Design a protein around this ligand. Structure first.
Ligand SMILES: *[C@@H]1O[C@H](CO[C@H]2O[C@@H](C)[C@@H](O)[C@@H](O)[C@@H]2O)[C@@H](O[C@@H]2O[C@H](CO)[C@@H](O)[C@H](O)[C@H]2NC(C)=O)[C@H](O)[C@H]1NC(C)=O
Ligand SMILES: *[C@@H]1O[C@H](CO[C@H]2O[C@@H](C)[C@@H](O)[C@@H](O)[C@@H]2O)[C@@H](O[C@@H]2O[C@H](CO)[C@@H](O)[C@H](O)[C@H]2NC(C)=O)[C@H](O)[C@H]1NC(C)=O
Ligand SMILES: *[C@@H]1O[C@H](CO[C@H]2O[C@@H](C)[C@@H](O)[C@@H](O)[C@@H]2O)[C@@H](O[C@@H]2O[C@H](CO)[C@@H](O)[C@H](O)[C@H]2NC(C)=O)[C@H](O)[C@H]1NC(C)=O
Ligand code: NA
Lengths: 410, 410, 410
């Protein structure tokens, strides 16, 4: 007969037994303070201090750091030999991290040879494209998850409690409820954020950063994921061997010659900037306060001075947690799955959520009806980094250890 | 003087004449149950059973099924003839559903002919690209419309009513109001959902699935919309005829050789997965429950035990409906328009909404001020399938027949 | 000790001292009217007229007008001369606004010359691509900012006040609060809106309109930003010179030949339409009412008849404003920054917002704690046009002049 459930975060109240309601639209980038002495209508001389502090909205973005985007110049060179396979000779572009070679092997002919080459169907004209004058222009981050929150502190008499409240969640206590409701549409999963400097200050949003095909000229075309090593772009144009009598062959390439950075800069007003304040970069995560004062969220504060609220998630159920296994990846839009062993006592069943968390950041949650005794719960999550130890959590309680997920893009 | 309006779904209340309020943030993937005996303060011995059941959030997506995405291999063949027009000969790739031929016609020459061909300016070198080793890898669906809802059942005494409540709509009865407020940003119109298996389980979101230009290597490059017949990708590279004395010409192609499926798999962590539970595929529609427990919505429940709420949409107006005509398409982001003949009586005017619906799914709505007598109302909608009969509807009332829209992509 | 803050738009109330609450979900495209006489419970004969009018939701989009998109035909011509540099001769495509020339200079040869040309390594074969049969097919607009609002008028007794209330903001007066809460996901920043006619009526949303690389065949490939002058697309295919003995060379081009307009039309159902009503185009801004009756927002109205609400933003602080400087651009996703000189009196500090506005449209806001005396406040904004004079504003108060930002895409 009982069907305990703690997935409802909020309260039951009787409107005539409720003393105060604050309801307002608050600038997202603003804090809010409320202080009041709750006095007894005047049948008493007993007063309760109420002190509420709401902090500015914070955004937390789980990301994959993509490394640096580069500007560069596309260069073309020709190397001709009258005799010998193309691989017999070393070419100047061989040291270039990003090069692309097209060979014309065993194709010498009378009207396309230098004066000293009498070869026909011999040797090699090698054409080499390579990037040079490389310079990093910014750091790029792929958005995996976006969350907004406000830190909320409530003092009611001598009770004082602070909590980070996610947007569209509620702060719940015996005498005070604080609910935050809102929506923001600035950032999307899969967007790529580009920071051109120590871009505290701000950055750019790219909605079409190249992924499965990067061609030279694309946003994101030339990337270095870590200090050394490039992900090189494709060069989709064609080579031609230009021929003349008594003349060395000359390679031509008819594709785009202008880097993605230059093409983006040339139409920079087509792209959306954002600003940041009090940035915090950690591995695969960025947190900041967006100073855009045009954005607002909705705050509702309900206070009952005498009778307690009915906490809609109240229950006698008791949970023990440990991690069992993990699969999947950090830094990945596909994500990981954490398997948890969860013990339920003091209730035949309990509808609740089990979360994958590390250091008070949560990366995933599974709603589940647990049965008395042991339960196996799989939690899907996204985000984290190589050093993350994802723990199985229930409310503020977590297991004693956590597990690492695998690296993405292997 | 009267200006009846039923577009407001909700209630007028007097806070001192209201007995109970539940206000909370609920895990989207969780149900919620509230049961209570409403007793008379103690001036009576009369109690009313209140029983509220809120079901897990469901997503309903109107889609266009795009068929299967394929992996495959790009092959190149050459066919040379010393004499004759290129069309005089049948080539091996002619049976390939996806092939592309480039001809060098009447271009034979001394330094590019096999030993037995003395032709000059004759015959044909035919170059043929074709896809083979084709294998379907997943089913793709273009998102047309996204809607979220929760089924809400309220028993108040012997009154019992269940309704599917859309997110950002309200359940309204004489004694109980249930409002659901929320926002989700996981899916967008125009996204393409890819299911790799019986992907109950989950799938991938693609934000850049090819549409007006599909090149080989793109996400979505090789599609079969129905069982037989391909939408073939473009091959944007160039052919070359490689020549040698006393040698048959050899075709070369310098474009990308790697399928879109392989390119996407090679950077799969760049893409966003989603999970599903209790999937229901119907023609051009998918419904499921998203098990992502990180998502929440806001629930407000208001109860008055004695005096009825003031139903803000209450009115004496009476409506008769029939379909008149339709234009436009199902399975289309452009959509259809249903024309309805709507008769108003018992009111000089009535501000309301007329909807296009089939089997309790609604695909479009028009807010309108009707005048006494006959009215012509055009309703824009999107979604449905070839078997849909779109009816003109008002509230829960619909016309006696419905109409079919036309097929998309003709 | 005081910490005045006017960034909270709303009220403090005591639920037992509140007389009326209206709470409902309203069709976005519908107006709403409430009229009532608030009578004194019956201890009096004094009645207060309450009259609330809520207008249909309006969308306001700050845009950059991109000019007209064109359909056209891609044509190819050859021009051969036996002798002379390619630049020595004028070619037919030279007058074409969008043309692309590939030259084969000093490459004549025996098996590729007309009968009257004995040249070897001389002259020129010039290949010219050009667009012709150009026709504008629609007007395109890049979305910079999206905002929704409703005009709200409240009469309470002889007090009458009308205000445009942004979605997720509140109307605040002594006796009536009106809060609007909602979310819409139809349009996104960076989307491109295409109107094919006087498209009052509607248009199409493009999520991938070309920007930093436009190739022929892309959505947005051929644009004319203003009356005269094209932004021409790239032609990424290859030229070939087809050769025969005693024959003039013939240029070939192997790239896509089909315009972006034709490719988009051929799969038009892949794209999302929207409808409009009562459109208003101004420079770099479009406003309309979306007639999509499937969309709803949430309205809460709270009334206290006797005791005033506690206005949570009430304060004694006084502000003087003037513009100081500006940098950045109108019509730009990167935006501008307006620097304001702001004088605070009657308070040691004041937490508030300073806005950049022109003619009652606001383009940006900065939340700031001002100190008594002079303050310098930088406000980031987006939108506007060449004729905008951005003023520094606080609430409904603005400075005496405003400043122009610079043009984008210089
Ligand atoms: C939630 O989804 C994950 C994701 O796995 C799926 O990814 C989709 C995008 C699609 O490609 C699909 O074919 C694929 O299965 C599920 O986890 C996976 O489960 C399979 C089957 O056991 C394993 O082989 C995978 O290694 C595993 N991956 C991860 C990262 O865990 C998961 O089962 C599903 N359901 C739940 C409850 O989480
Ligand atoms: C709502 O919009 C539809 C859509 O029609 C428009 O589609 C735009 C994307 C754009 O291309 C525009 O040029 C086009 O008109 C309107 O319906 C269309 O109306 C025209 C004019 O009568 C007809 O020729 C079309 O067949 C018709 N199409 C459909 C699907 O009905 C519609 O009029 C408009 N208004 C309302 C109230 O629905
Ligand atoms: C808010 O952001 C603007 C934007 O400027 C930045 O744009 C980013 C996309 C990125 O490219 C970054 O490197 C760049 O600085 C800031 O304004 C700019 O500030 C610099 C430094 O003084 C000036 O050189 C620019 O001209 C100026 N541009 C504009 C349009 O004002 C701004 O400082 C930042 N902070 C605030 C409080 O607005
Ligand atoms: Na080419």
């Amino acid at each position: 007969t009982p069907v305990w459930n703690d997935n409802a975060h909020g309260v039951g109240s009787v409107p005539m037994h409720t003393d105060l309601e604050l309801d307002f639209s608050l600038t997202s980038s603003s804090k809010y303070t409320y202080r009041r002495k709750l006095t007894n209508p005047l049948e008493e001389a007993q007063s309760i201090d109420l002190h509420i502090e709401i902090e500015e909205q914070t955004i937390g973005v789980d990301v994959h750091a993509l490394g640096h985007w580069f500007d560069g110049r596309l260069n073309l060179k020709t190397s001709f030999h009258c005799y010998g396979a193309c691989t017999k000779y070393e070419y100047p572009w061989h040291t270039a991290k990003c090069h692309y070679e097209r060979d014309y092997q065993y194709e010498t002919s009378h009207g396309c040879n230098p004066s000293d080459c009498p070869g026909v169907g011999t040797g090699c004209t090698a054409c080499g494209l390579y990037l040079d004058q490389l310079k990093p222009v910014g750091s790029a981050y792929k958005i995996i998850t976006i969350r907004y929150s406000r830190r909320v502190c409530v003092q009611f008499g001598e009770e004082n409690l602070c909590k980070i409240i996610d947007m569209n969640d509620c702060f719940v206590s015996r005498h005070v409820k604080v609910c935050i409701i809102g929506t923001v549409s600035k950032f999307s999963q899969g967007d790529t954020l580009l920071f051109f400097g120590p871009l505290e200050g701000g950055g750019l949003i790219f909605k079409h950063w190249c992924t499965s095909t990067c061609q030279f000229g694309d946003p994101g075309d030339i990337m270095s994921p870590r200090d050394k090593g490039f992900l090189c772009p494709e060069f989709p144009g064609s080579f031609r061997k230009k021929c003349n009598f008594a003349t060395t062959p000359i390679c031509e390439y008819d594709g785009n010659m202008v880097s993605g950075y230059k093409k983006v800069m040339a139409t920079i007003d087509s792209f959306q900037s954002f600003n940041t304040s009090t940035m915090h970069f950690t591995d695969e995560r960025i947190e900041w306060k967006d100073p855009d004062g045009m954005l607002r969220d909705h705050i509702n504060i309900l206070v009952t001075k005498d009778i307690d609220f009915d906490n809609l998630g109240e229950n006698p159920c008791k949970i023990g947690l440990q991690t069992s296994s993990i699969e999947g990846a950090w830094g990945s839009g596909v994500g990981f799955t954490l398997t948890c062993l969860v013990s339920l006592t003091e209730c035949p069943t309990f509808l609740t959520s089990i979360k994958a968390c590390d250091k008070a950041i949560c990366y995933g949650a599974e709603s589940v009806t647990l049965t008395r005794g042991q339960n196996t719960v799989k939690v899907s999550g996204k985000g984290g980094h190589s050093g993350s130890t994802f723990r199985c959590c229930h409310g503020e309680d977590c297991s004693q250890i956590g597990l690492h997920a695998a690296a993405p893009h292997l």
